[PDB]
Design a protein around this ligand. Structure first.
Ligand SMILES: [Cl-]
Lengths: 606, 577
């Protein structure tokens, strides 16, 4: 009967903070009697549980319960899981929202493929990607790729309820644990769960809400490595498939242990460094097998080797040398063609978007430029980039400013070259061409009117640069394509944006008007205002209005009339319908297409 | 010397506390006040040399000094200027002298004129008085004999241009004193109709009072480009259409009525385009041109930086870009180098106005410095640069430049406070009518120390990504940034020489900077912190710190925190004595 159960823990949660959440559930296309809401309050000390209980009385599919306070959301999640009746369970946190077609699409995907876990595409407020690797294409048999299919391991997936009960998969109830959701998803996979990835529709919006946690638990350096030790022991004791154990070992050794040996060494005091360095050296010796480092890139093998040697001074010097390496992309050309937007971009590896990043060519080896002092202490292959010069990636991406959803722009062609600038020094240059088909990223009705931000992702030599596309010159190009206003522009921050639906810019203002080509039809009451610079493809009819005020009347009253933006035969124009309005004299015309007024100083004599 | 002081809602104690710090004999300079206050009388009775537009013209005859200056509110005057300006004007018999002026912001002030001293600077023309600030030194004889006077009456813009031009028109002898920084201007016409009524009054003053044709065409060219054509560039992108239409029609009316046609012959290509379209009334083309010209600059990166002998050396590279991003390009059509423009604008213009062919050899590329405490700017002499026009793709050409220069910090030290202050490096690139004077930047971390003739110098990439040079530990600790080879620490328990050598540093000459240290017990959170004497030595291409414990009374392992010139270290020096 019930397809989905929504599990939402609360604690001193005001009803106003649930307004956006409850609104996103009401907007679900799935019938309300086919899902249920299970709120479990963690023993609120204030009077917020009373207001929530009264709120649920008007909603039959919503049940609320309070337990004794546990100081954590794991026990509320478990209590609600055993209360739930639905076939699938979504763990929805009260600060987050869901997209309107999530329940319909996810359940159909899971039921038609008999999935135990549907890892749906998740969206975050910040960043240019989330789940870039896994949220690529739909995969009903995702567990065949190994335990990696569940990354990123947030709890915001849809888990089959009976599968959790049969395997007794719960959240840790006792002491608080870091990366608790990693334990939960890993336990689900090692019990043979069928995993499906739904990547073609954003399902969950994980919202950043000024996380000034102010918790000594999350800042205690000894607690941190106590939690890291038990996380790795959990891997080694429970994950028995060699392929999946080795992946989790390398992934978390790279991110959490090796991740303090880079920029982190430049923004921490010396005593904090000594404490966490000795913790990391001991953990690598005790829990990280030596073969794991063979799966790491060159720069991480150097960090691994120097860590096990206890050479903190060399790692500090290397952190200073690597600081600032990036790859910013510049727009070399941008234009509309037919029904798409085209880009030509260029990039190169630099230090802070300044001087070039170099690599030396000694003998037949492309080597990392390092001091002779540090270089004479490392294995010679670890600073040899020769085998890695053919594995650069250069791709475009897009991000909706309202939905915060992120997509890879397919169909691009790129090329990365290793060029000799001078002597034996080599830079890394990249070129790319791609087109944007905005229909590929419009899924919900609200997506049709949205500013879009364009980014570039450049990887190579172990570095990853996912940054916004930028330009120096002023760029303003307009287009009217199949009932969609489109403008590519250098925004106020100096980055490239695409405003569709006149949510930022007026297309009449940015295109300009053929001033001496305005036609006034007296017998028809139609005023034609042709647009100057604009790319028009297909038929378009966009309705707005126009305000008329007589010239020279300081306090003149607005004469609101109807207007239309018409795209027809590769030409755009605004038709101001005057009808039978009694008018005479000179007037000011101000178009208002899609809630955006122009500043073209249009005057008209009638 | 007589100093004038105009009270305008009068800071008053501050101005007297700065003027009394001069080197010249106090009974050799006079101070004149005008208030036509009850606390003014009390400041005059305390000490002798203090008498108590319209307020400044009465004070001109009221004074009895050979040379007189016009000191404004909140403005500073450097210590040695009084005597240096008097001896320079007397031995050269100057009617007016323009000492080196200093502003808070920017990387230069009077770049062209204030480069070299010239006591016979009136030979070149009226340009020698630029920039025409009221902050020069004037002789009472030439002012009273020629009746040169701030135009009393309603507030007039560029009265400094009136007061400085009227002096030169009446045959004034002026010397440029770029040897030493003198006046410090702290600073701190809004209506569009007031603005252009004043601009009309300025140009009418030129052709009515300036008789020398060379001095007339200069002022006519210099101010038509800055104030009239100056609103046709970025200004068109920062104002509303109403303001633009009112101001553009004023600018068009002044060009037609006052500015002759032959003035455009002395302008560069881009300004000739602005003059042509202005007289045509084509505001649409100028607005489009402002969008195309926006963001054009040239940023310089550090290719290499090192100490050699007793100088700091740099090797920089630059390239004309749009806002430090993609490259600025010029087109090669037929045999001429054209600027990239649409066909709608290129067809509306004379073909010569967008041809950079005869200008590709006029590029400049020079260095600069600035004392962060003094805000004084200088040009680094003895530099080698080269600009190249390089084909990148198809017929598109970019402007690339490379440059090498060295720095001697004793050249820019003039006051006792100049010995210890941060220094900021900058580059100046000029070409095709554009001028980019930006700070020297670097992306990678740069930290290099040196010990040269008791000067402790460090070149470092600052928090803003720019190049800075700390001299005297005003910002950084040379011990921390040089490193410490703790394995080579020596201990002479007999006399007490606790030797601490430094790792990476460029030592030159002999140096002997003194300081102290602070010792603490190991791990014991708190205890009596007793400080001991310490000393920093630089001998024979090596630097070392020698701690002094002549009265030894410690036992166990101890923390050593050096402290040279008020800058401790983070080297974690644990000593065991
Ligand atoms: Cl924007």
């Amino acid at each position: 009967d019930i397809k989905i159960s929504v599990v939402v823990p609360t604690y001193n949660t005001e009803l106003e903070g649930l307004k956006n959440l409850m609104a996103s559930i009401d907007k679900q296309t799935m019938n309300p009697d086919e899902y249920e809401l299970v709120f479990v309050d963690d023993g609120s000390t204030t009077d917020t549980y009373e207001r929530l209980q009264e709120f649920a009385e008007t909603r039959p599919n919503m049940t609320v319960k309070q337990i004794e306070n546990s100081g954590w959301g794991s026990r509320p999640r478990n209590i609600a899981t055993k209360m739930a009746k639905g076939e699938y369970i979504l763990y929805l946190d009260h600060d987050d929202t869901v997209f309107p077609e999530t329940f319909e699409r996810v359940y159909n995907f899971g039921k038609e493929n008999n999935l135990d876990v549907v890892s749906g595409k998740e969206v975050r407020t910040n960043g240019w990607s989330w789940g870039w690797k896994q949220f690529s294409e739909n995969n009903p048999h995702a567990e065949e790729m190994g335990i990696e299919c569940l990354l990123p391991m947030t709890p915001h997936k849809f888990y089959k309820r009976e599968f959790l009960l049969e395997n007794d998969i719960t959240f840790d109830d006792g002491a608080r644990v870091l990366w608790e959701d990693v334990y939960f998803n890993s336990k689900a996979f090692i019990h043979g769960a069928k995993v499906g990835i739904l990547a073609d529709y954003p399902t969950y919006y994980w919202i950043a809400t000024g996380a000034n946690n102010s918790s000594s638990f999350g800042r205690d350096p000894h607690e941190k490595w106590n939690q890291i030790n038990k996380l790795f022991n959990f891997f080694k004791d429970n994950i028995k498939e060699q392929r999946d154990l080795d992946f989790m070992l390398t992934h978390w050794y790279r991110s959490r242990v090796l991740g303090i040996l880079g920029q982190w060494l430049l923004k921490n005091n010396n005593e904090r460094i000594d404490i966490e360095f000795n913790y990391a050296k001991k953990l690598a010796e005790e829990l990280i097998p030596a073969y794991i480092s063979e799966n790491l890139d060159k720069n991480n093998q150097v960090k691994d080797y120097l860590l096990r040697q206890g050479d903190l001074d060399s790692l500090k010097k290397l952190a200073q040398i690597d600081a600032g390496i990036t790859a910013l992309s510049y727009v070399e050309d941008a234009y509309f063609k037919e029904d798409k937007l085209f880009f030509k971009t260029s990039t190169k590896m630099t230090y802070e978007d300044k001087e070039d990043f170099f690599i030396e060519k000694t003998a037949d080896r492309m080597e990392r430029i390092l001091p002779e002092e540090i270089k004479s202490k490392l294995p010679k292959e670890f600073f040899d980039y020769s085998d890695d010069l053919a594995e650069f990636t250069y791709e475009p991406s897009i991000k909706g400013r309202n939905s915060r959803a992120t997509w890879k722009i397919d169909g691009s062609t790129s090329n990365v070259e290793v060029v000799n600038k001078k002597a034996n020094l080599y830079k890394i240059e990249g070129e790319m061409s791609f087109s944007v088909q905005i229909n590929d990223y419009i899924l919900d009705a609200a997506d049709k009117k949205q500013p879009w931000d364009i980014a570039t992702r450049f990887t190579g030599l172990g570095y990853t640069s996912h940054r916004a596309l930028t330009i120096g010159k002023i760029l303003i190009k307009t287009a009217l394509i199949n009932n969609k206003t489109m403008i590519v522009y250098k925004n106020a921050s100096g980055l490239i944006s695409l405003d569709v639906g006149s949510s930022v810019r007026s297309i009449v203002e940015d295109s300009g008007v053929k001033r001496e080509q305005i036609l006034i039809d007296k017998t028809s009451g139609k005023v034609t205002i042709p647009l100057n610079e604009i790319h028009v493809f297909g038929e378009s009819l966009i309705e707005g209005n126009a305000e008329l005020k007589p010239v020279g009347i300081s306090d003149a009253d607005p004469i609101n009339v109807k207007a239309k933006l018409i795209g027809e035969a590769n030409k755009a124009r605004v038709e101001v319908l005057l009808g039978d309005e009694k008018l005479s004299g000179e007037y000011h015309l101000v178009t208002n297409i899609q809630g955006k007024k122009d500043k073209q100083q249009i005057k008209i004599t009638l």
